[PDB]
Amino acid sequence: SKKVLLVDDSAVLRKIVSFNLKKEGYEVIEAENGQIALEKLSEFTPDLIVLDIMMPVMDGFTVLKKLQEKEEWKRIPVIVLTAKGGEEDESLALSLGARKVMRKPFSPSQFIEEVKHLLN
Amino acid sequence: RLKRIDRMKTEFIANISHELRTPLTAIKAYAETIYNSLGELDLSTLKEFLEVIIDQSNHLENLLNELLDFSRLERKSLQINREKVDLCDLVESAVNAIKEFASSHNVNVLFESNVPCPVEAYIDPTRIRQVLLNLLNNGVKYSKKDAPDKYVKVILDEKDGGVLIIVEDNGIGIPDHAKDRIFEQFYRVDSSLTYEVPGTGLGLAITKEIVELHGGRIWVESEVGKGSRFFVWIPK
Ligand SMILES: Nc1ncnc2c1ncn2[C@@H]1O[C@H](COP(=O)(O)OP(=O)(O)O)[C@@H](O)[C@H]1O
Ligand SMILES: [Mg+2]
């Protein structure tokens, strides 16, 4: 029933995060890059977005930025899940509207705890 | 005495971290999922997940062999060992090893010989396979974003009492100021078109040192946005 837009350029990463999300009964739509993600928002409005930073075509900082430029989007919570480990990368993502930033490698169980907290 | 930058060393360190982090993210997430989901995995998905762990370990191992190989060449402790080999099976073997990585990026990989096979040469097969793999790898990593006809091709020929191996791609190409530097240790072109591509900048320095240990040379030709040709000449 709850719908998550999962945005990452690694198929390997998407598979494992989609597996843990569907374990909870969530529905998953995949985007391979940030532009594809923004195009998917015309088909639907997800209850949550899981967002990578480093992606070809359109990165995650740019996604976050544009998400704040439409009003239907600007309110969908976003959890950023990224190999980017700097405090300044985190601050920037938060300043751009992300609700939470988690750094890869990640614990799948901690990640699902945080996904739940944003969906409740 | 001007050789290198300490800043290049700082970027290198950061890059190793970044490149190793990706397969490690997969290993840890897949392993912990299996551990916490035994009742929720069917057998084909359990085996699938274990095969991801294994395949991501193998990628990581390769990245570690690159660091090692480089330190060895650097301290001139890597002595090559030559023998007659058929480069046509060598090149086909290398194209084979790269198919998975390549289709994951929708890159087609071809092999044409201008001369009839086998093309026989006195080379270290292991070290020359490593040269071919770094060029094919590069052709995939640096291929165009969003294109339906992406390719890397190996073209083999016999020239100048030697073998001439060209690896051609239709990828992003290399700006002219960069052609003089790409073979140097730690050097990576830094552009909005390489931001998400991982690497250390060791690949082509290792390739070049290996080619030179055979008394051969490697050079490049490229057009920004058209693609590139790496030329490897080795004596027979
Ligand atoms: N086929 C290619 N097309 C475009 N750029 C390339 C290609 N091969 C190599 N390069 C560039 O040369 C740089 C150095 O290559 P290499 O030494 O293999 O390092 P890495 O792949 O770890 O950066 C790359 O970062 C990239 O900028
Ligand atoms: Mg990414």
Author numbering:
A (entry chain C): 2 to 121
B (entry chain A): 243 to 478
Lines quoted from the article behind this entry:
To confirm if the pH regulates the His260 side-chain conformation in HK853 and, consequently, the pH-gated model for this HK, we solved the crystal structure of the complex HK853–RR468 at pHs 5.5, 6.5, 7.0 and 7.5 (herein HK–RRpHs structures) in the presence of ADP and BeF3− as in HK853–RR4685.0. Crystals at each pH diffracted X-rays at good resolution (~2.0 to 2.85 Å) and all of them contained, in the asymmetric unit, a symmetric dimer of HK853 bound to two molecules of RR468. The overall structure of the complex at each pH was similar to the previous structure of HK853−RR4685.6 and HK853−RR4685.0 complexes, respectively and as expected, ADP and BeF3− were present at the active centers of HK853 and RR468, respectively. A close inspection of His260 in the HK–RRpHs structures showed the presence of the inactive gauche− rotamer, as observed in the low pH HK853−RR4685.0 structure, independently of the pH used for crystallization different from the trans rotamer observed in the HK853−RR4685.6 structure. This observation ruled out a pH-induced mechanism in HK853 to acquire a trans or gauche− rotamer for the phosphorylatable His. Our structural data on HK853–RR468 complexes at different pH do not support this model since gauche− rotamers are observed independently of the pH, even at neutral pH 7.5 where the pH-gated model favored the trans rotamer. To check the correlation between pH and the relative HK–RR disposition we superposed the HK–RRpHs with the phosphatase-non-competent HK853–RR4685.0 and the phosphatase-competent HK853–RR4685.6 structures. This comparison revealed that all the structures, independently of the pH, showed higher similarity with the phosphatase-competent HK853–RR4685.6 than with HK853–RR4685.0 (RMSD values ~0.7 vs. ~2.0 Å for the superposition of ~707 residues, respectively). In the HK–RRpHs structures the DHp helix α1 and CA domains in HK853 adopt an identical conformation to HK853–RR4685.6 and the two molecules of RR468 are also placed close to the DHp domain as in HK853–RR4685.6 structure with no inter-domain rearrangements. Close inspection of the His260 in the HK–RRpHs structures showed that this residue was also interacting with a sulfate ion through its side-chain Nε.
